Amino acid sequence: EANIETHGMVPMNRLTDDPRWLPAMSERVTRMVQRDRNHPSVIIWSLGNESGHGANHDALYRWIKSVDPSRPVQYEGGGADTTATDIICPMYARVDEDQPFPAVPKWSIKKWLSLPGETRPLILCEYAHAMGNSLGGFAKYWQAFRQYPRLQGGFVWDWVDQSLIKYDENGNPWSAYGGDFGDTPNDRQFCMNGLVFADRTPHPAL
């Protein structure tokens, strides 16, 4: 996945729809493909994450398809089924319940496969957000994956908690999150979404 995320912009594609940022973005895609294209374990390219859908995404998708046709390209931004992706790759689409947001609806995974015109496979780029005591309903996804042939799985969010070690007054280490370093504004415990603790001890959800 290329090092492109512009989630903080308003709207999300304010840079990725702008031709003056097309050189910057193109360097982040083309230099990744040139470095990693010989690795057999790499089977899919990604254009980045949470950057809306802009014209630069469509351009860089067509660049990768020209230079390396041996790997599908995917990209979630702008509703997860745009022309910049070969795979329908939504984040946190539910199995049976639709989430009808305005421009970017998250349809039920089962419903999304049958919308008129849609023919692509569906692989969730993020699902089953494992923040703390979580992964309720995980069996519902896997029942759906096995039953539906075009539901080909997904990628859980995520592997390891992003906590940092701080030390108390007696030098005992403790796991810290968000505003524990004086950083403000911050987003508190939301960095810790892992199936494993930061020392790689498993959570019960694993």
**27 included as an active-site residue:** no
Residue list 182-201, contact with Na ion (CB under 5 A)? 190, 193
CA distance 8 to 2: 17
CA dihedral 77, 156, 116, 86 (to 10 degrees): 60
Among 24, 115, 165, 206, binds a copy of itself (CB under 8 A): 115
The smaller minimum CB distance to a copy of itself, of residues 121 and 203, is found at 121
Query: What is the smallest separation between the CB atom of 67 and Na ion, expressed in angstroms?
Result: 30
**How does DSSP assign 78-100, residue by residue?**
TTS-STT-SSB--BS--SS--B-
Among 67, 114, 146, 166, binds a copy of itself (CB under 8 A): 114
CB count, 10 Å around CB of 101? 9
The smaller minimum CB distance to a copy of itself, of residues 36 and 98, is found at 98
Query: What is the smallest separation between the CB atom of 121 and Na ion, expressed in angstroms?
Result: 8
Q: Bridge partners of 167? A: 173
Three-state secondary structure call for residue 181: helix
| Active-site amino acid positions | 50, 126
For a copy of itself, the binding residues (CB under 8 A) are 98, 108, 110-111, 113-116, 119, 147-150
For Na ion, the binding residues (CB under 5 A) are 149, 151, 190, 193
